[PDB]
Coordinates of all heavy atoms in Angstrom, one line a residue:
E1 N 72.0 126.8 253.2 CA 72.2 125.5 252.6 C 72.4 124.4 253.6 O 72.6 123.2 253.3 CB 73.3 125.5 251.6 CG 74.7 125.8 252.2 CD 74.8 127.2 252.7 OE1 75.0 128.2 251.9 OE2 74.7 127.5 253.9
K2 N 72.5 124.8 254.9 CA 72.8 123.9 256.0 C 71.5 123.2 256.5 O 70.6 123.9 256.9 CB 73.4 124.6 257.1 CG 74.8 125.2 256.8 CD 75.5 125.8 258.0 CE 76.9 126.4 257.6 NZ 77.7 125.3 257.0
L3 N 71.4 121.9 256.4 CA 70.3 121.1 256.8 C 70.6 119.7 256.8 O 69.7 118.8 256.8 CB 69.1 121.4 255.8 CG 67.7 121.0 256.3 CD1 67.2 122.0 257.3 CD2 66.8 120.8 255.1
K4 N 71.9 119.4 256.9 CA 72.4 118.0 257.0 C 71.7 117.1 255.9 O 70.7 116.5 256.2 CB 72.1 117.4 258.4 CG 72.7 118.2 259.5 CD 74.3 118.1 259.5 CE 74.9 119.0 260.5 NZ 74.6 120.5 260.3
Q5 N 72.3 117.1 254.8 CA 71.8 116.3 253.7 C 72.4 114.8 253.7 O 73.2 114.5 254.6 CB 72.1 116.9 252.3 CG 71.6 118.3 252.2 CD 71.9 119.0 250.8 OE1 71.1 118.9 249.9 NE2 73.0 119.6 250.7
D6 N 72.0 114.0 252.7 CA 72.5 112.6 252.6 C 72.2 111.9 253.9 O 73.1 111.8 254.8 CB 74.0 112.6 252.3 CG 74.3 113.4 251.0 OD1 74.5 114.6 251.1 OD2 74.3 112.7 249.9
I7 N 71.0 111.4 254.0 CA 70.6 110.6 255.2 C 70.0 109.3 254.9 O 70.5 108.2 255.3 CB 69.6 111.4 256.1 CG1 70.2 112.8 256.5 CG2 69.2 110.6 257.3 CD1 71.4 112.7 257.3
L8 N 69.0 109.3 254.0 CA 68.4 108.1 253.5 C 68.0 108.2 252.0 O 67.5 107.2 251.4 CB 67.1 107.8 254.4 CG 66.7 106.3 254.5 CD1 67.8 105.5 255.2 CD2 65.4 106.2 255.2
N9 N 68.1 109.4 251.5 CA 67.8 109.7 250.1 C 68.9 109.4 249.2 O 68.8 109.2 248.0 CB 67.3 111.1 249.9 CG 66.1 111.4 250.8 OD1 64.9 111.2 250.3 ND2 66.3 111.9 252.0
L10 N 70.2 109.4 249.7 CA 71.4 109.1 249.0 C 71.5 110.2 247.9 O 71.0 110.0 246.8 CB 71.3 107.7 248.4 CG 72.6 107.3 247.6 CD1 73.8 107.1 248.6 CD2 72.4 106.0 246.8
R11 N 72.2 111.2 248.2 CA 72.5 112.3 247.3 C 71.2 113.0 246.9 O 70.1 112.4 246.9 CB 73.2 111.8 246.0 CG 74.6 111.3 246.3 CD 75.3 110.9 245.0 NE 74.6 109.7 244.4 CZ 74.9 109.3 243.1 NH1 75.9 109.9 242.4 NH2 74.3 108.3 242.6
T12 N 71.3 114.3 246.6 CA 70.1 115.1 246.2 C 68.9 114.9 247.2 O 68.1 114.0 247.0 CB 69.7 114.8 244.8 OG1 69.3 113.5 244.7 CG2 70.8 115.1 243.8
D13 N 68.9 115.7 248.2 CA 67.8 115.6 249.2 C 66.6 116.4 248.7 O 66.5 117.7 248.8 CB 68.3 116.2 250.6 CG 67.2 116.0 251.6 OD1 67.1 115.0 252.3 OD2 66.4 117.0 251.8
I14 N 65.6 115.7 248.2 CA 64.3 116.3 247.8 C 64.6 117.3 246.7 O 64.9 118.5 246.9 CB 63.6 117.0 248.9 CG1 63.3 116.1 250.0 CG2 62.3 117.7 248.4 CD1 62.7 116.7 251.3
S15 N 64.5 116.9 245.4 CA 64.8 117.7 244.3 C 63.5 117.9 243.4 O 62.9 116.9 243.1 CB 65.9 117.2 243.4 OG 65.6 115.9 242.9
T16 N 63.2 119.1 243.0 CA 62.0 119.4 242.2 C 62.2 118.7 240.8 O 61.2 118.4 240.1 CB 61.8 120.9 242.0 OG1 62.8 121.5 241.3 CG2 61.5 121.5 243.4
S17 N 63.4 118.6 240.3 CA 63.7 118.0 239.0 C 63.2 116.6 238.9 O 63.6 115.7 239.6 CB 65.3 118.0 238.8 OG 65.9 117.3 239.8
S18 N 62.2 116.4 238.0 CA 61.6 115.1 237.8 C 61.0 115.0 236.4 O 61.4 114.1 235.6 CB 60.6 114.8 238.9 OG 59.6 115.8 238.8
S19 N 60.0 115.8 236.1 CA 59.4 115.8 234.9 C 59.1 117.3 234.4 O 58.1 117.5 233.6 CB 58.1 115.0 234.9 OG 58.3 113.7 235.4
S20 N 59.9 118.2 234.8 CA 59.7 119.6 234.4 C 60.6 120.0 233.3 O 61.8 119.6 233.3 CB 59.9 120.5 235.7 OG 59.0 120.2 236.7
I21 N 60.1 120.8 232.4 CA 60.9 121.3 231.2 C 60.4 122.6 230.7 O 59.2 122.9 230.7 CB 60.9 120.2 230.1 CG1 61.8 120.7 228.9 CG2 59.5 120.0 229.6 CD1 63.3 120.7 229.3
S22 N 61.4 123.4 230.3 CA 61.0 124.8 229.8 C 62.1 125.4 229.0 O 63.2 125.7 229.5 CB 60.6 125.7 230.9 OG 60.3 127.0 230.5
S23 N 61.9 125.5 227.7 CA 62.9 126.1 226.8 C 64.3 125.3 226.8 O 65.3 125.8 226.4 CB 63.2 127.6 227.1 OG 62.0 128.3 227.0
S24 N 64.2 124.1 227.4 CA 65.4 123.3 227.5 C 66.5 124.0 228.2 O 67.7 123.7 227.9 CB 65.8 122.8 226.1 OG 66.9 121.9 226.2
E25 N 66.1 124.9 229.1 CA 67.1 125.6 229.9 C 68.0 126.5 229.0 O 67.8 126.5 227.7 CB 68.0 124.7 230.7 CG 67.3 123.9 231.7 CD 68.1 122.9 232.5 OE1 68.8 123.3 233.5 OE2 68.2 121.7 232.0
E26 N 69.0 127.2 229.5 CA 69.9 128.1 228.8 C 71.3 127.5 228.7 O 72.2 128.1 228.1 CB 69.9 129.5 229.3 CG 68.5 130.2 229.4 CD 67.9 130.3 228.0 OE1 68.2 131.2 227.3 OE2 67.1 129.4 227.6
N27 N 71.5 126.4 229.4 CA 72.8 125.7 229.5 C 72.8 124.5 228.6 O 72.4 123.4 229.1 CB 73.1 125.4 230.9 CG 73.3 126.6 231.8 OD1 73.7 127.7 231.3 ND2 73.0 126.5 233.1
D28 N 73.2 124.6 227.4 CA 73.3 123.5 226.4 C 74.3 123.7 225.3 O 74.1 123.2 224.2 CB 71.9 123.1 225.9 CG 71.3 124.3 225.2 OD1 71.5 124.4 224.0 OD2 70.6 125.1 225.8
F29 N 75.2 124.7 225.5 CA 76.2 125.0 224.5 C 77.2 126.0 225.0 O 77.1 127.2 224.8 CB 75.5 125.6 223.3 CG 76.4 125.9 222.1 CD1 76.8 124.8 221.3 CD2 76.8 127.2 221.8 CE1 77.7 125.1 220.2 CE2 77.7 127.4 220.7 CZ 78.1 126.3 219.9
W30 N 78.1 125.5 225.8 CA 79.2 126.3 226.4 C 78.6 127.2 227.5 O 77.5 127.9 227.3 CB 79.9 127.1 225.4 CG 80.7 126.3 224.4 CD1 80.3 126.0 223.1 CD2 81.9 125.6 224.7 NE1 81.3 125.2 222.6 CE2 82.3 125.0 223.5 CE3 82.8 125.5 225.8 CZ2 83.5 124.2 223.4 CZ3 83.9 124.8 225.7 CH2 84.3 124.1 224.5
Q31 N 79.2 127.2 228.6 CA 78.7 128.1 229.8 C 79.8 129.1 230.1 O 80.6 129.0 231.0 CB 78.5 127.2 231.0 CG 77.5 126.1 230.8 CD 77.4 125.1 231.9 OE1 78.4 124.8 232.6 NE2 76.3 124.5 232.1
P32 N 79.8 130.2 229.3 CA 80.8 131.3 229.5 C 80.5 132.1 230.7 O 79.5 132.8 230.8 CB 80.6 132.2 228.2 CG 79.8 131.4 227.3 CD 78.9 130.5 228.2
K33 N 81.4 132.0 231.7 CA 81.2 132.7 233.0 C 82.0 134.0 233.0 O 83.0 134.1 232.3 CB 81.6 131.9 234.2 CG 83.1 131.4 234.1 CD 83.3 130.2 235.0 CE 84.8 129.8 234.9 NZ 85.0 128.6 235.7
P34 N 81.6 135.1 233.7 CA 82.3 136.3 233.8 C 83.8 136.2 234.2 O 84.1 136.0 235.4 CB 81.5 137.1 234.9 CG 80.7 136.1 235.6 CD 80.4 135.0 234.6
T35 N 84.7 136.2 233.2 CA 86.1 136.1 233.5 C 86.6 137.2 234.3 O 87.0 138.3 233.7 CB 86.9 136.0 232.2 OG1 86.3 134.9 231.4 CG2 88.3 135.6 232.5

């Protein structure tokens, strides 16, 4: 994850998230993590 981010893009250095969608993800009603 080391690549020195935040230079001229201001947060989120090159993100695929733009116009992609599928099953509306699985996170949209409580995110229960392994306690």
Side-chain angles (χ1 to χ4, degrees):
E1 64 289 284
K2 298 185 179 304
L3 195 76
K4 303 289 176 297
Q5 304 182 90
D6 302 89
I7 303 298
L8 207 64
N9 299 272
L10 184 70
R11 295 184 295 170
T12 62
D13 182 89
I14 304 175
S15 60
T16 63
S17 59
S18 59
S19 304
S20 300
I21 183 67
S22 180
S23 301
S24 184
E25 298 175 87
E26 300 301 276
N27 296 331
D28 59 88
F29 188 76
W30 295 103
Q31 303 168 330
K33 60 199 178 181
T35 307

